[PDB]
Curated annotation (Swiss-Prot):
The active site is at 77 (proton acceptor), 150. Belongs to the peptidase M16 family. PreP subfamily. It is found in: Mitochondrion; Mitochondrion matrix. GO terms for molecular function: enzyme activator activity; metalloendopeptidase activity; metallopeptidase activity; zinc ion binding. Mainly exists in a closed and catalytically competent conformation but a closed-to-open switch allows substrate entry into the catalytic chamber. Substrate binding induces closure and dimerization. A disulfide bond may lock the enzyme in a closed conformation preventing substrate entry into the catalytic chamber, participating in redox regulation of the enzyme. Inhibited by metal-chelating agents. Inhibited by nickel and zinc excess, and slightly activated by manganese. This is Presequence protease, mitochondrial. The gene is PITRM1. It comes from Homo sapiens.
Amino acid sequence: AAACERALQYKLGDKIHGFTVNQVTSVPELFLTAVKLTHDDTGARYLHLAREDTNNLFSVQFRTTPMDSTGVPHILEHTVLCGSQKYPCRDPFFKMLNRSLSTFMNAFTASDYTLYPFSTQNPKDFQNLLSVYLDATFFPCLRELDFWQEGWRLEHENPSDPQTPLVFKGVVFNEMKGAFTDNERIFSQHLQNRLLPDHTYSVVSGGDPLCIPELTWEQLKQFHATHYHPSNARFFTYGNFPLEQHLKQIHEEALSKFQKIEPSTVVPAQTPWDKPREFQITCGPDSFATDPSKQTTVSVSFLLPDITDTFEAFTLSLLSSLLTSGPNSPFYKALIESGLGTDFSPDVGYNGYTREAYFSVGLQGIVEKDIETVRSLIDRTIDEVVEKGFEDDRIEALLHKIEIQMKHQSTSFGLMLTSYIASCWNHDGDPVELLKLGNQLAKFRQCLQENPKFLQEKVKQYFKNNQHKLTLSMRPDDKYHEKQAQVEATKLKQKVEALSPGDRQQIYEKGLELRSQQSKPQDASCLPALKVSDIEPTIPVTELDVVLTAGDIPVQYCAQPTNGMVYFRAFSSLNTLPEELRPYVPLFCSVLTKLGCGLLDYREQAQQIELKTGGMSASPHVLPDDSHMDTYEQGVLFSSLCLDRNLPDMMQLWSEIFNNPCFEEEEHFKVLVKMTAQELANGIPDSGHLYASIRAGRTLTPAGDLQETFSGMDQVRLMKRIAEMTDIKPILRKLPRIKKHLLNGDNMRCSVNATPQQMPQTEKAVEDFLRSIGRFKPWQMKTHFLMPFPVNYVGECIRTVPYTDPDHASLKILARLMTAKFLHTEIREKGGAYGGGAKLSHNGIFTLYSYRDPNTIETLQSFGKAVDWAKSGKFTQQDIDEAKLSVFSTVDAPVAPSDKGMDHFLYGLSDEMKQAHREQLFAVSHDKLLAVSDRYLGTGKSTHGLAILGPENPKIAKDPSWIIR
């Protein structure tokens, strides 16, 4: 039933579809089995990580090592995604998201590799996306006109007048123009180029605008045939789907058509310098800065070993973070707090994307006279670090942070694994050694416990005795870009002079054919797509067991491969709370865990939180019932995170928070309240449509009113009013009353997510923790918030049926239909708004929203034409298939193991209820959609709510049906 148990049955030397198993390793601490295969005929490497995670991932990696600054892998990456041999339609990438049930689809271009990852949860969707990716990457139609479109071309300023002079055009060409107006990209690029001047890292891999137009179509085709060949490729697969199907697809679709070649793509070692060097560069003066004489940037860079030696790379990365990350670092206190500059230099810290990594530090925003002062200060700082070493708490905090960031469970775990092994794997390294994190942590801890001067001798060797130092300074000149334009125009004249009139007519006619290609709407019906039969009918059941303990508090344990992590959550009701103290609970939850407990002041408390746990947070939640519009559960969610070994320390911290919260620390409290108020106040536009949908829905259901009090605009205004008061003490007296009504054990329930091997110790620690703690008529309203915004935020809510009603699925499918085919086109293309759609919440509120719309009345008019369109039924059965595909992409969205299962613990939705709602999503038909659109969305048939956040609108101000607050 598990993945790694059957994955351990793969023996070494087994031949599967042309591949040979070379290595199989069980990684019990990571709940996965790694399998290394190579195709005998082609030489392609294959790595399979089998882990019981439904988000299956494929990734393909190509080693592209350019030998000039023409930009061939960036232009080639843009060009291969424009069409393939079996799928000649344009842009499979963008035209394959609407036909798949994918959760992720992108592409990456690093300095020395290109990466094409995708992820999906449906095995037939995996087969389809795997076939389209193999055909797009390995067999693209590489048409010359696409190379003229994406790369570089000569084009008239008006394509219909062939008498105007010719200029250079291209998308990548102007991308690189905009790359080299940026001073930061010039600084980083020149740092990398001067620091590694021997081989491929010395050039501009993205393309320098003056040397890019020397690339021909034939060189691009030859580069694609040599580097986009399976012998120069790395294949990656992750997840629980049967391995045999993937290998059978790879062999029968791609690898059989190729033969073995030998890629001349190995990156040689950087030859070490004997003496440090200095260089001076020039840039363009920026207009956002306020002082022009103080715009010089300087940096100091050191050469580090290769990433191949895993141990030394991990320790030097840790050392570089210890030296540069955070305001407690030596170089921060030496440089930032000196008042010499404004921020760190670009690429500051550890840079591990190249084969040989490099470390960089420096300052920006200094006067040019201070260069030798800065260099001497950095040298003295390195001397002080050699002389004093590091304190033990900072080393423990860093090792605990790296252990958590590697072990913490995200929803896109496979993406973190492929991004974490791509750089090492690109230069023939062993990716499994990066996975055995326990071994490297153990070896580092042993090397510190055995030799107290380990880190000081490392800092000495790589910083004081390292002669491969580069000091690079940059100062702006006001006529830099005009000089660049002059030399580019000179290269332009040099290239245009050689054209014959027949060439000029060929360029003109190709320009007209290119304009037709860029204008003509084309068809994408040749790509495969999923139907309502390839979607799994039932979900795999999630195993739970509820154990009542001490003596009637339910505690839910869910055994999951959480990767050595224990996640504790507790939910305390608000039924006992007096109604006056309700609006102050967001403040309470945001400050409960930040003022200190017992014998620890707030700084030591924060140090303990960062050193023992992964974070402890509290947030209010309003959980509606799924079967009654006027029933909801209100409470506060306590959430925590820790490693397995630090669990009793975390529960002791929770006992001290529950029994002795420090409601007397007022000085730090004023800082915290001003900081949360400023952070919430600056963030109003970015979540404006959320605040509008919460305000509009306050008057429709009790849950909406409670959501407005807990997380609406009323909470922001109240928090700002409290944060502007000079005497906070009468507010501070309200917090012990909240402690006495919330922090008790009468109406509590808890949940625990942990590994199955940890479960009995967790049951003991949790029971000890519980023994250590004490024992409607809707009505319309219109509101306009006068905000100094340049854009608007509109929200309309409609009252519909709850989750368990069979009509809920029809309302949800109709909502997704309306989003995909009416409101998106009408508001976006015509209106011009940046975002716009419709949403249906779990409680039964049908919510309409608009994001950055320049109009107001036109939004309501598009609402009237949209409900008219929805009642008209003018959509085909293919729209129903696309809406079903999108809704199953939304409701079956992946949940991380740290939230599996969260819905049962919070909202009380069983697997039976989800299966019933899934069969209701299956049973929706076109005529039932016509019935429900004619029954609920029509005017006067249901209750509406309106709210608008945005700037002054005079016509709305003269509307008596609007209330201004």
